[PDB]
């Protein structure tokens, strides 16, 4: 269970603070998330007219709603990932 | 005997698949674009759009996560931590 002692030792072993790995992961997935919502709006806007109606409006608000849903899923799931990793992977048992 | 790097690869992959769940549901993608759905070809565009976005999500996360794991030598470091832990309990 975490202390400055165990984390400092794991830092010496890794070459970096444990949380820098989790940060890289989370920072990477958040960049990918916004690439995906950006590609979705770009794909649909290219195809914003069908028949005779112009859906340019519904597309931008609709993609903004899906991005908010992904932000919440990403936030929920990788908060769990952060906990698990720091408890079961980047951690030293009580043997010390 | 080595389990930690495998836990890491598995939960990372798990977390990624769980995060795009509500993007795989054709019902959520049908209510963010209600009118665009009712159209015949708007359906065809939406369904190909989610396929391509899910693809982009999987391929980029794949490559970027493995790059991180190599940069930080995390597999070696976690293997050595498994060895040290197993050695302590011997």
Describe this structure in words.
Chain A: This is KLLA0F02343p. Chain A: It comes from Kluyveromyces lactis (strain ATCC 8585 / CBS 2359 / DSM 70799 / NBRC 1267 / NRRL Y-1140 / WM37). Chain A: It is found in: Chromosome, Centromere, Kinetochore. Chain A: Belongs to the mis12 family. The complex is a heterodimer of chains A (96) and B (90). Chain A has three helices and two strands; from the N terminus they run H-H-E-E-H. Chain A has 96 residues and is mainly alpha-helical. Chain A has one domain. Chain A has a two-stranded antiparallel ribbon with strand order 1-2. Chain B is mainly alpha-helical. Chain B has one domain. Helices cover 86% and strands 0% of the residues of chain B. Chain B contains six helices and no strands. Chain B is elongated and about 65 Å long. Chains A and B meet through helix 1, helix 2 and helix 3 of A and helix 1, helix 2, helix 4, helix 5 and helix 6 of B.
Structural topology:
The complex is a heterodimer of chains A (96) and B (90).
Chain A: H1 4-14, H2 18-46, E1 49-50, E2 53-54, H3 56-88
Antiparallel strand pairs in A: 1-2
Helix pairs in contact in A: 2-3
Chain B: H1 4-19, H2 21-24, H3 28-31, H4 34-38, H5 40-71, H6 74-89
Helix pairs in contact in B: 1-5
Organism (chain A): Kluyveromyces lactis (strain ATCC 8585 / CBS 2359 / DSM 70799 / NBRC 1267 / NRRL Y-1140 / WM37) (Yeast)
Protein name (chain A): KLLA0F02343p
Family (chain A): Belongs to the mis12 family.
């Amino acid at each position: 269970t975490p202390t400055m002692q165990s984390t400092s030792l794991l830092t010496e072993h890794l070459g970096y603070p444990p949380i820098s790995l989790v940060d890289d992961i989370i920072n990477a997935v958040n960049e990918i998330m916004y690439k995906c919502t950006n590609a979705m709006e770009k794909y649909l806007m290219q195809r914003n007219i069908i028949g005779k109606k112009d859906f340019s409006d519904e597309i931008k608000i609709g993609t903004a709603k899906l991005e908010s849903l992904l932000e919440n899923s990403v936030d929920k799931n990788f908060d769990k990932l952060e906990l698990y990793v720091l408890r079961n992977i980047l951690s030293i048992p009580s043997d010390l | 005997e080595h389990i930690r790097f495998q836990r890491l690869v598995q939960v990372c992959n798990k977390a990624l698949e769980e995060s795009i769940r509500k993007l795989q549901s054709w019902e959520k993608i049908h209510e963010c674009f209600p009118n665009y759905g009712q159209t015949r070809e708007g359906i065809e565009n939406l369904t190909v759009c989610q396929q391509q976005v899910i693809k982009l999500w999987s391929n980029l996360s794949r490559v970027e996560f493995d790059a991180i794991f190599h940069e930080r030598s995390i597999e070696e470091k976690l293997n050595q931590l498994d060895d040290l832990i197993n050695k302590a309990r011997s």
